Amino acid sequence: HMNAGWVIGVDPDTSGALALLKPNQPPQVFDSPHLKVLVGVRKRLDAKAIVQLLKSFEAPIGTTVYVEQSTPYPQDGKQGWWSGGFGYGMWIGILVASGFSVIPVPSSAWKSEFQLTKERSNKDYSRQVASQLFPSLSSLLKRKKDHGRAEALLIAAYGKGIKIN
Amino acid sequence: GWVIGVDPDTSGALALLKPNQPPQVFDSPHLKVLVGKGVRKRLDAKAIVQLLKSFEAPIGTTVYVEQSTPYPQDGKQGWWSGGFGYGMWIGILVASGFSVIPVPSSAWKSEFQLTKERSNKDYSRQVASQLFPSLSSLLKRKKDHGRAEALLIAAYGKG
DNA sequence: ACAACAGATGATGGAGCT
DNA sequence: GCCTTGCTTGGACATCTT
DNA sequence: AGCTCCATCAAGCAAGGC
DNA sequence: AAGATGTCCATCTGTTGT
Ligand SMILES: [Mg+2]
Ligand SMILES: [Mg+2]
């Protein structure tokens, strides 16, 4: 049956974001909190700020959350393979440990519902798509670096349409 | 008062040191996921959460987690699994209210001496079964490296 | 400083010394 | 079956096409 | 702060041995 | 049931441009 609860979508990359769709209320989008961690320095997801961001929502138990399940290319550096596994594994861990119902979503699935093929590609037009589905947040999607916000929104609007049990 | 040590890899362990109760080690629960062709073993986050909750440890108990630092020669997939296990344990632990402290693999050497010569083929399992003779039974097979590693991280944290 | 862009795809931690 | 050893170090996923 | 060394794994998948 | 085919990302580091 059709999901009437709260729907969250997560772009788990280190410049990713989380979108929160409540029924009958305006959509919201949040950039993922990060840290300067010395390794010199790079960005890691901030688990502590994430959990307190999730705590702030005060969502019901078992609220469904759709997490993009992404898969680096053979030519991407091993460091990026590591970071990829880290953000994904941290997001699942926090969400599962926080009582959310977690659904991984292949990148192809949500891009499929919104007709983001080679022509009119997701990188060049996903922000625009998110804008016209959620006009109230189009101010936060006016920049290239906001690609993450847009994906989180479209992952959420994808999962919203998935019938549940 | 309580000390937990965690080896975060796909066949790692978690060790739990209580005051006035014997020490304990647990294998990390895993499920089987289907990636590409064949199946991969991943940490089961649902089961880990249940495990921690069963401990009934004080709020904000300190958990030492071994840092994942793979070699250049290692495959990309193993870099990814490394980051995954590490980030998942960190996620679960922080969200469950524990206090996480990352520990490098070499950190326990400073307290208990280890060297490239006379390398740990089975050396780790010996140091842990010395320090925790209660559990010498569950350390007698090579597969039990991860349990020894969890214990030894725990003993570093405690010390 | 913040952003957009271009290009390759990459170890890391630590102790001793300058 | 499970345990150990030896070896490289690695795409995943959906869609056509036999 | 720099900069020399130098030590630290693991995943994943075939075979054998039991 | 397979097998070949197609089509998807991103990190991390400098460099340029607001
Ligand atoms: Mg992504
Ligand atoms: Mg280890």
Numbering used by the authors:
A (entry chain A): 106 to 144, 147 to 272
B (entry chain B): 110 to 268
Which passages does the manuscript contain on this structure?
Recently, mutational screening analysis identified the chloroplast-localized HJ resolvase MOC1 that is essential for chloroplast nucleoid segregation in Chlamydomonas reinhardtii and Arabidopsis thaliana. MOC1 exhibits dimerization and an RNaseH fold, belonging to the retroviral integrase superfamily. Moreover, we characterize a base recognition loop (BR loop) that protrudes into the junction and disrupts the C–G base pairs at the crossover. Residue D183 from the BR loop recognizes the cytosine, determining the cytosine-dependent HJ resolution.
After tedious trials, we finally determined two crystal structures of the NtMOC1-HJ complex at an approximately 2.5 Å resolution in the P21212 space group. One of the structures contains the active NtMOC1 and HJ with a noncognate CATG core sequence, and the other is composed of a cleavage-inactive NtMOC1 mutant (D116A/E175A/D253A/E258A) and an HJ with a cognate CCGG core sequence. Here, we use the complex structure of NtMOC1-HJ with a CATG core sequence as a representative to demonstrate the catalytic and binding features. NtMOC1 in the complex also exhibits dimerization, and the HJ is embedded into the cleft of the dimeric NtMOC1. In the HJ-bound complex structure, HJ exhibits an open planar and X-shaped conformation with an overall two-fold symmetry. The center of the junction is opened by NtMOC1 into a parallelogram with cross dimensions of 32 Å between the non-exchanging strands and 9 Å between the exchanging strands. The scissile phosphates are in close proximity to the two active sites of the dimeric enzyme. Four acidic amino acids, namely D116, D118, E175, and E258, coordinate a magnesium ion approach to the cleavable phosphodiester backbone, constituting the catalytic tetrad. More importantly, D183 specifically recognizes the cytosine (C9) via a hydrogen bond. The pairing of D183 (protomer A) to the cytosine (C9, from strand F) led to flipping out of the initially paired guanine (G10, from strand D) from the duplex.
